[PDB]
Amino acid sequence: DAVPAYPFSLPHALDLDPHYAELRRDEPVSRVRLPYGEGTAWLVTRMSDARIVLGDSRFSTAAATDPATPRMFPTPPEPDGVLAQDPPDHTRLRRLVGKAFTARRVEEMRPRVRSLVDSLLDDMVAHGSPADLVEFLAVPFPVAVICELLGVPLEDRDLFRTFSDAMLSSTRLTAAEIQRVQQDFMVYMDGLVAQRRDAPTEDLLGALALATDNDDHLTKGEIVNMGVSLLIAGHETSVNQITNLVHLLLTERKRYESLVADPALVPAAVEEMLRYTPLVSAGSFVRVATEDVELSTVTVRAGEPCVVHFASANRDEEVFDHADELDFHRERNPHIAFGHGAHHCIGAQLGRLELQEALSALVRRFPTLDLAEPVAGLKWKQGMLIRGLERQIVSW
Ligand code: HEM
Ligand SMILES: C[C@@H]1[C@@H](O)[C@@H](C)C[C@H](C)C(=O)[C@H](C)[C@@H](O)[C@@H](C)[C@@H](C)OC(=O)[C@H](C)[C@H]1O
Ligand code: NA
């Protein structure tokens, strides 16, 4: 083919491909072939182009549901998915559940959440050093939180985790495998909301079931798909992001010691580490211009698709000083770790709360925390659209 394959390469730990910094400098918007659908997409590497592709009404995610649209993942996007709804229906779909995810209702969770983190750190001191931080904190903590929030039975963790890993496949699985799991996840979630039909609950699944009986603008598929989106995102992001921030802290240990030194640096350290880490391994859900749109170096034509690399916008030397350097004393940090525009993460305040409480708790109660397995053998998850560790053995 004429144009290059994206992703450019199999990923390495949390390392940014050095082609991203080259593209930022000399070819900020470049033709790429995505691993699925047909044709070519524009890859967007710098912050101001990213803010436009994510920000502007001229770009449609709905339009990207066409099976022939380029995408990073094997199944054509599900049309009832939030990510694939354009405003204003997108705005109506997000109000179903938005109430619960406002910064103010998330601040109210801090105590419940800080207890939870204390129990799990109790059970780790009980087991004794070494222990797998994945096993004792990363997985059970966030899984417990969205289970309480959604009203999903904690006893289903092995069930929904397996569905959730399959639906975040890049290469590990095939279209037919994933499409199968989508159907199961749909039918499962449809069943959990169904149980609320006679017995409404003080729950987001509760709210989703209420919405199914009375709403006239949203399909049952949209409302139920909402519950799967929140159950996947609500654990998959935080589970990976706790291993990623711990990996960044302990592999140049000065950082971890800087937070043990001052545990009030932890909210700023979280934002800085959200900026620094390619949690999304490559690309994004795709946006198709509905009209000509001007970017820094090119006019994207109506019908041309675009894809963003969040981690590369977060390294743009024209908005962050010493961008390739980890710094907890940055005066300003306008990162897009949580996206931008209508699809800006609903969970951003929750993911902040969960990461703050996990790191505060560690950095206060375990000053002696060190990686007790070698860097070279670290089990980075492979062939998923997200990055994170399968395990993280730590001593103290
Ligand atoms: C550290 C945690 C998190 C990170 C880094 C993260 C990152 C992101 C990013 C970058 C997007 C935008 C994708 C795009 O527009 O193409 C996004 C969207 C989303 N995130 Fe998060 N997220 C996190 C936590 C959460 C949590 C805790 C939830 C749910 C409880 C969640 C649910 C979502 C949902 C549903 C979307 C799609 C929203 C929409 O289409 O309107 N995320 N997230
Ligand atoms: C399964 C996810 C979906 O649950 C979303 C809402 C969860 C997370 C928080 C996201 O929204 C996430 C940032 C995705 O947009 C990307 C990982 C993208 C490459 O993957 C996706 O586009 C995939 C296929 C989505 O459907
Ligand atoms: Na897409």
Annotated active-site residue 236? The verdict is yes
- Is 233 considered catalytic here? yes
Q: Give, for 63, the enclosing helix (H) or strand (E).
A: none
Q: Which atom of ligand 2 is nearest to the CA of 164?
A: 1
- Per the residue annotation, which of 21, 268, 323, 345 is the catalytic one? 345
CA distances from 206 to 82, 118, 193, 200 (A): 19, 28, 7, 5
Q: For the CA atoms of 231, 380, 350, 312, what is the dihedral angle to 10 degrees? A: -110
The answer to whether 177 is a known catalytic residue is no
Active site residue 281: no
| CA-based end-to-end distance of the chain | 52
Could you give the C-alpha distances from 205 to 75, 141, 146, 190, 236, in angstroms and in order? 26, 20, 11, 10, 19
Catalytic entry in 78, 222, 236, 304: 236
Q: Which helix (DSSP H) or strand (DSSP E) does residue 124 occupy?
A: helix 103-127
C-alpha 71 to ligand 2 mean position (Å): 11
At 69 the three-state DSSP class reads coil
Q: Which of 271, 354, 357, 358 is catalytic?
A: 354
User: What is the gyration radius of the CA atoms in the chain, in angstroms?
Assistant: 21
Q: How far is the CA of 374 from the centre of ligand 1 (A)?
A: 31
CA dihedral for 183, 184, 188, 194, sign (positive or negative):
positive
Q: Is the CB of 308 under 6 A from ligand 2?
A: no
- Structure solved via: X-ray
Residue in 41, 63, 207, 233 annotated catalytic? 233
3-state secondary structure of 29: strand
In Å, the largest CA–CA distance within the chain is 61
Q: How far is Cα 75 from Cα 178, in angstroms, rounded to an integer? A: 7
What are the structure tokens assigned to 1, written together? 């083919």
Our count of domains for the chain comes to: 1
Strands 41-44 and 305-308: parallel
Q: Active-site residue 164, yes or no?
A: no
**For every residue of 133-175, which 3-state class applies, written as one string?**
HHHHHHCHHHHHHHHHHHCCCHHHHHHHHHHHHHHCECCCCCH
- Could you list the residue range(s) of the whole structural domain that residue 59 is in? 1-396
Please name the residues in contact with 79: beta carbons below 8 A apart, sequence gap of 6 or more: 62, 65
Give this entry's resolution in angstroms. 2.2
Q: From CA 142, how far away is CA 144, in angstroms rounded?
A: 5
20 C-alpha to center of ligand 1: Å? 23
Choose one of 113, 345, 354, 355 to mutate for the ligand 1 pocket test, by most ligand atoms within 8 angstroms of C-beta: 345
If residue 314 lies in a helix (H) or strand (E), which one and from where to where? none
What is the spatial distance between Cα 396 and Cα 367, in angstroms, rounded to a whole number? 8
| Spatial contact of 46 and 28, defined as CB atoms under 8 Å apart | yes
Protein residue whose Cα sits closest to atom 16 of ligand 2: 284
- Give strand pairing partners of 307: 43
Which residue type does 253 have? Answer: R
Residue 68: DSSP 8-state: T
- Distance between CA 266 and CA 359 in Å, rounded? 7
Q: What 3-state class would DSSP assign to 386?
A: strand
Give yes or no for residue 244 CB within 6 A of ligand 1.
Answer: no
CA of 157 to the centre of ligand 3 (A): 27
Whole-number Å distance between alpha carbons of 148 and 200: 15
On the question of a cis peptide bond just before residue 7, with omega within 30 degrees of 0, the verdict is: yes
The secondary structure element, H or E, covering residue 43 is: strand 41-44
| Cα angle for residues 269, 274, 277 (degrees, 5° grid) | 115
8 lines ligand 1 (CB under 6 A): no
CB distance 163 to ligand 2 below 6 Å: no
